[PDB]
């Protein structure tokens with residue numbers, strides 16, 4: 001609590017400081033969208049690559065100062081931890097990790113924190129169902145890998161291939177025309193595997209949303 | 221408030237006046253559906269093109285009188301502003317803009333105003349989530365444009381192409397058979413991009429509707 | 441109220457009488473499923489065609505007696521009117537109309553009447569939205585028929601073709617891969633027509649179900 | 661209630677006993693996922709096949725002891741009956757039935773029993789609607805088998821083929837591009853069969869979920 005610590009603390013905790021970050025984030029948002037254009041990279045190529053280094057410097061500077069002012073409390077703050085790693089991740093597909101910077105606009109702007117927290121608060125109630133769901137996939141991914149993986153390697157050769165395909169069946173994306181009707185050319189009873197799979201997986205997802213609705217009706 | 225202003229005001233505010241517009245709208249609705257038929261345009265070609273000019277005249281006449289009688293209040297009335305521009309838009313793909321006329325049937329008929337207002341009143345609560353949603357698309361549209369846009373220009377070459385495709389993935393339309401399974405031929409880990417994208421985008425849309433339901437349960 | 445009228449009335453209003461109809465219906469249900477088999481039609485061909493005449497006789501007999509016993513009240517009873525026409529429709533694709541007989545199993549069995557009435561009672565509240573919905577399709581079916589019907593006759597040549605396709609887009613069935621991406625080969629801005637169409641049509645359907653839920657929460 | 665019965669009863673009813681089963685189940689879960697790998701079966705082939713015999717022995721031992729300790733009450737316990745048959749089914753596509761073992765992890769772990777019971781408790785209320793639903797499919801499966809089964813055997817030749825296709829149409833999977841648009845090449849009015857089919861089947865599923873939500877709002 002010296003005159004040195006309170007100097008930085010009054011800057012960091014200032015409203016300008018935050019507005020500066022938000023203003024940066026948004027610019028770097030824009031400029032990363034322009035870096036898409038080969039037209040514009042061909043011209044203003046150097047102007048952007050430094051600007052991304054400048055902003056990560058500023059963000060590192062910023063993320064250091066936030067640590068000083070908060071020390072251990074900073075590492076008990078999701079949004080800081082997020083801002084931490086996202087800036088770290090962007091320091092170290094190399095160029096890709098960068099754009100995660102822009103996710104800070106959620107951390108920085110507090111109407112987003114609000115919304116994001118609303119959505120995340122729903123996830124804890126679901127884990128019980130997600131657990132049953134993921135066990136169910138695991139059991140069925142195994143069955144399908146050995147039932148069909150032989151004559152149908154592309155879709156069910158590995159365990160992970162049956163995982164992907166089964167998740168595809170869950171989304172109902174081409175499940176019949178693209179998968180189960182071809183499987184039936186060889187294994188005419190595969191419909192006994194997949195229609196029950198659809199029913200179960202569907203019913204669960206339905207109930208899940210009913211639960212989400214009713215869990216957020218116990219509060220009203 | 222002269223004897224001239226009250227003359228028109230008693231006509232405009234009359235019930236016949238409105239019934240006349242509604243009756244027109246519906247006819248012009250019908251006749252624009254017949255203008256679809258090359259058979260019927262080949263015969264009654266002239267009969268319709270003037271009829272659309274007649275009706276826009278009447279609608280301009282009408283939309284003028286509504287302004288006199290209401291002056292500035294007319295430009296603080298959505299439904300008037302809508303009726304205004306829709307008739308203006310139809311005055312100035314040229315022939316297309318016309319058919320927007322028919323949208324007045326919503327403005328004119330008050331059981332539609334009712335329904336339309338019910339739906340629009342939900343939109344303000346959503347913007348917070350839509351904002352987070354559109355930021356999320358923007359970030360991912362950028363990643364996919366550089367991750368895949370090279371070997372896959374048709375789907376991810378521009379930023380807007382990744383936008384369209386990502387919205388397609390959101391609708392789950394052919395997302396696996398049509399997009400992610402082909403991408404995996406080249407980039408075998410693309411599933412790490414798209415399954416999380418689906419989960420997030422899905423979960424949000426789910427919560428959005430839960431919110432819509434619960435926001436309209438705080439009123440009951 | 442003679443000794444003749446009360447004779448039939450005590451038979452018609454009996455529990456056996458109803459059990460007999462239900463028992464018939466179910467048999468004719470079964471036998472119509474067997475008439476699917478060319479194998480079984482090749483053998484027991486005559487046995488079934490008379491059995492369907494027998495049952496419609498019995499149903500006509502039955503539907504006459506119900507009229508005697510109830511006279512005008514019979515034509516103020518949906519379920520009778522339904523039973524009426526379904527038996528009439530089956531008297532007069534000829535063979536198809538028959539199978540509608542089986543829909544009486546809903547009329548006859550009262551746990552179905554219950555469920556069916558629960559579902560129908562929801563329809564009156566929706567008409568307002570359905571009206572706005574069908575107007576919206578009509579307006580857009582017109583626009584698409586003239587925007588695209590030329591270079592794309594199969595999907596948008598008539599008005600009804602644009603209706604079908606637009607309903608297909610609503611179901612999100614192949615809307616992008618199958619329709620809007622091909623349209624974009626020629627008309628690169630068609631996405632400005634169809635994404636807004638999807639948004640509107642989607643949002644409405646969402647709200648519709650929210651309304652259905654909340655309209656059946658004003659009762660609790 | 662001898663000193664012999666209480667010996668086993670105190671073992672079976674112990675917490676270790678259950679932890680041992682759960683620990684086994686999870687291992688056998690893991691090892692059955694590795695038996696997917698031809699790589700790993702080529703090496704550790706014998707190690708796994710006995711391990712599955714060992715575990716079913718233990719599970720048979722276990723499932724015997726549970727019967728002693730509970731006698732007739734064991735056959736009035738779903739979870740036991742389930743554990744019973746799943747172990748029996750795994751004793752007697754031969755190798756497939758095995759993996760059903762892993763479903764015991766639901767029976768064993770009581771946070772799963774909880775979730776599973778929550779979902780099953782919803783099914784009794786639905787049967788009334790499911791009954792109407794399955795009758796409806798039956799009636800329409802019959803109509804489509806005779807309307808289209810001739811020129812379109814692959815999709816509607818048998819009754820079961822029309823069942824599968826109609827369930828596919830219900831899922832909206834390729835219903836137009838893949839089925840109804842081809843049917844329309846020959847039978848141009850098939851849209852009169854399938855759009856109403858979609859509407860009905862959709863509306864019902866919607867209401868079903870509304871019911872599920874409201875039936876679980878009578879408890880709050």
Ligand SMILES: CCCCCCCCCCCCCC(=O)OC[C@H](COP(=O)(O)OCC[N+](C)(C)C)OC(=O)CCCCCCCCCCCCC
Nearest residue numbers: 026029030033034037038039102105354355358378379380
């Ligand atoms: C955290 C950050 C928040 C700030 C968000 C900032 C939003 C604005 C970003 C703007 C980025 C614009 C990028 C852009 O235009 O890229 C170029 C591409 C394709 O152009 P290009 O490749 O040059 O084509 C050249 C063709 N030639 C040679 C014949 C002339 O152009 C296109 O393909 C069009 C791209 C349209 C992009 C629409 C962006 C919507 C952003 C919504 C953000 C919401 C945030 C809450």
Ligand SMILES: CCCCCCCCCCCCCC(=O)OC[C@H](COP(=O)(O)OCC[N+](C)(C)C)OC(=O)CCCCCCCCCCCCC
Nearest residue numbers: 246249250253254257258259322325574575578598599600
């Ligand atoms: C704001 C306005 C409200 C008023 C709404 C008025 C509704 C009624 C509009 C009727 C428009 C009829 C248009 C029409 O039939 O167009 C022609 C087409 C195709 O015929 P065409 O091209 O002549 O084929 C000739 C073939 N040939 C040479 C071999 C004979 O025929 C078809 O393809 C059949 C088109 C069926 C259209 C169904 C319209 C439903 C309208 C629902 C409106 C609800 C409003 C709340």
Ligand SMILES: CCCCCCCCCCCCCC(=O)OC[C@H](COP(=O)(O)OCC[N+](C)(C)C)OC(=O)CCCCCCCCCCCCC
Nearest residue numbers: 466469470473474477478479542545794795798818819820
């Ligand atoms: C209002 C009425 C209520 C009463 C409902 C009665 C339900 C039972 C109806 C049974 C109908 C059975 C029809 C049937 O099996 O048709 C034959 C077909 C195909 O056989 P087929 O064409 O003879 O194949 C010959 C092949 N060959 C020469 C090599 C031997 O066989 C198949 O393709 C199998 C068909 C399976 C049908 C499943 C029916 C489920 C009915 C659920 C009803 C619920 C009502 C609430």
Ligand SMILES: CCCCCCCCCCCCCC(=O)OC[C@H](COP(=O)(O)OCC[N+](C)(C)C)OC(=O)CCCCCCCCCCCCC
Nearest residue numbers: 134135138158159160686689690693694697698699762765
């Ligand atoms: C009731 C039981 C509860 C216990 C659950 C235990 C969960 C862990 C199970 C692990 C199983 C691993 C199986 C595995 O890796 O299989 C091998 C495959 C493909 O490898 P492989 O076929 O050897 O490829 C050789 C290629 N070569 C020759 C060029 C080297 O590898 C793959 O394709 C990757 C497979 C990823 C599987 C992801 C599993 C997620 C399980 C989630 C369980 C949740 C339970 C609540």
